[PDB]
Amino acid sequence: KDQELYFYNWSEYIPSEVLEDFTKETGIKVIYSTYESNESMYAKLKTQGAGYDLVVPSTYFVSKMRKEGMLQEIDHSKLSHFKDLDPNYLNKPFDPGNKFSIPYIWGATGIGINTDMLDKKSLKNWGDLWDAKWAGQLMLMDDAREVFHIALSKLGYSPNTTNPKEIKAAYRELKKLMPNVLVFNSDFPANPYLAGEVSLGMLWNGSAYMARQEGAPIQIIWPEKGTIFWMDSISIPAGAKNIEAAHKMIDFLLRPENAAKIALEIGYPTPVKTAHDLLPKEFANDPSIYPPQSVIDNGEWQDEVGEASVLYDEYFQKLKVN
C-alpha cells in the first residue's frame, strides 16, 4: 500500500525524467498511462470501475464525475504547495473549495498555422476554416467539445449550450467542414504540423510551442471571438488504493520549481502562481502562448453541459465515422 501509484493523465504533460525524479525522491513506483480526451479517459474509468489513484479531468468534467461518485475528496493539509496556487483559478462553481480537483495546467486552442506555407492575415475567425480552399488540409482536435465549440461560435450560439436544436445546428455546420478535414488528433497534435502533413487547423498553444522548439515555424492565430480556454485539474478516483502516494504526486507537481521547469518543456501556462513568477519574460510575454486581452474578453472557458454531453458525443462520433 502506497509503494506504487496508478496515474492516468493527458499525453505530453509529464516528461519521462519527471516521473523518474518522483520515484527517486519517494521510492514510489509510477504505473503511468495516457489519454487524448476527457471522453476517452471517462470511458476507461467506467469500464474499469477502479484501478487508478490519480486522474486529470478538464474542469467541465469535474462536477459530472463528482455527482456520479467517481471521485473522492482531496486533503489540502497533505499539499504543502496548495498556497502556491493562483487564487484566480481556485474555488469556482464546478468545485467550490477545491474539494475534488486541484488546478494543474491551463491552456487555449486557436488556429495553428505554418508561417512558411501559408498567410497569417487570411484567417481571423473559426468560420474561415470552412472556406473551400482548405479542402483535405485541416487538422481538428480529437475532442467533441472543442470541435462543437468552433461551430457553435461560428453560428453565434454559446459554445456551452444545452439547447439540443443548437447542438444539432452545430452538427449540420460541422458536416460542411468535413471535406476540409484530413485528421483528428489530440494525442500528439504538433506532429502533423512538424511533419508537413497539415499546414493549418485547430491547435493548442502548448503544442504550437513544442513545434517551434523543434524548429518548425508553427504559430497560433487567436480567433477574434470564440477562442477556446480550458483548465485540467488533478483528481483522486473513488476506488484509489494509494491515497498517500496520490497526494505526494499532486504536491510534487505543485512544487514551483517542478511546475516552472515542466511549463518550459511543454509550452503551457501554469495556474501555480509561484511557478508562473519563475518563468522568463520571453515565455510569459510570448503571444502564441498567452492570448491578448481582446482575445480573453471575446473568448470562452469550456464549461459543463450536464446531460447534454451525450448529444455532443453522439454527433461527434457520427462526424468522425461518416
> Domain map of the chain by residue range?
1-106+231-290, 107-230+291-322
DSSP 136: T
Q: What is the three-class DSSP state of 189?
A: coil
Residues 107/80, Cβ–Cβ less than 8 Å: no
Question: Of 221, 214, 224, which Cα lies nearest the Cα of 267?
Answer: 214
Q: What is the three-class DSSP state of 10?
A: strand
Residues contributing to the annotated binding site: 12, 60, 143-146, 302
User: In Å, how far from its chain's centre is CA 300?
Assistant: 14
Pairwise CA distance, residues 156 & 145, whole Å: 16
Contacts of 19 (CB under 8 A, 6+ apart): 30, 32
CA distances 113 to 66, 123, 162, 212, Å, are 38, 10, 31, 11
> What is the phi-psi region of residue 72: left when phi exceeds 0, alpha when psi lies from -120 to 50, beta otherwise?
beta
β-pairing, 138-140 vs 218-221, is unpaired
Beta bridge partners of 110: 203
Pairwise CA distance, residues 63 & 244, whole Å: 23
Q: What is the three-class DSSP state of 258?
A: helix
Method: X-ray
Cell numbers found for residue 160: 456551452
DSSP 90: S
Resolution, given in Å to one decimal, reads: 1.8
The CA-CA-CA angle for residues 38, 41, 42, to 5°, reads: 85
Buried b (16+ CB within 10 A) or exposed e, 100-114: bbbbbbbbbbbbbbb
CA distances 315 to 57, 93, 236, 311, Å, are 21, 28, 30, 6
Indicate the Cα dihedral angle 35, 36, 41, 43, nearest 10°.
-110
Question: Counting Cβ atoms within 10 Å, is residue 38 exposed (0-12), middle (13-18) or buried (19+)?
Answer: buried
β-pairing, 300-301 vs 228-234, is parallel
Cell numbers found for residue 212: 517551434
Please, how many CA atoms are within 13 Å of residue 242, restricted to the half-sphere of its CB? Answer: 21
Contacts of 185 (CB under 8 A, 6+ apart): 36, 139, 140, 141, 142, 191, 192
Extended strands (E) in the chain = 4-10, 29-35, 71-72, 102-114, 138-140, 181-184, 200-204, 218-221, 228-234, 236-237, 300-301
Residues 85/271, Cβ–Cβ less than 8 Å: yes
Pairwise CA distance, residues 44 & 263, whole Å: 27
β-pairing, 181-184 vs 4-10, is unpaired
Cell numbers found for residue 319: 462526424
Indicate the Cα dihedral angle 283, 226, 190, 90, nearest 10°.
50
Residues contributing to the annotated binding site for spermidine: 12, 60, 143-146, 302
Q: What is the three-class DSSP state of 231?
A: strand
Cell numbers found for residue 136: 483535405
Pairwise CA distance, residues 236 & 69, whole Å: 11
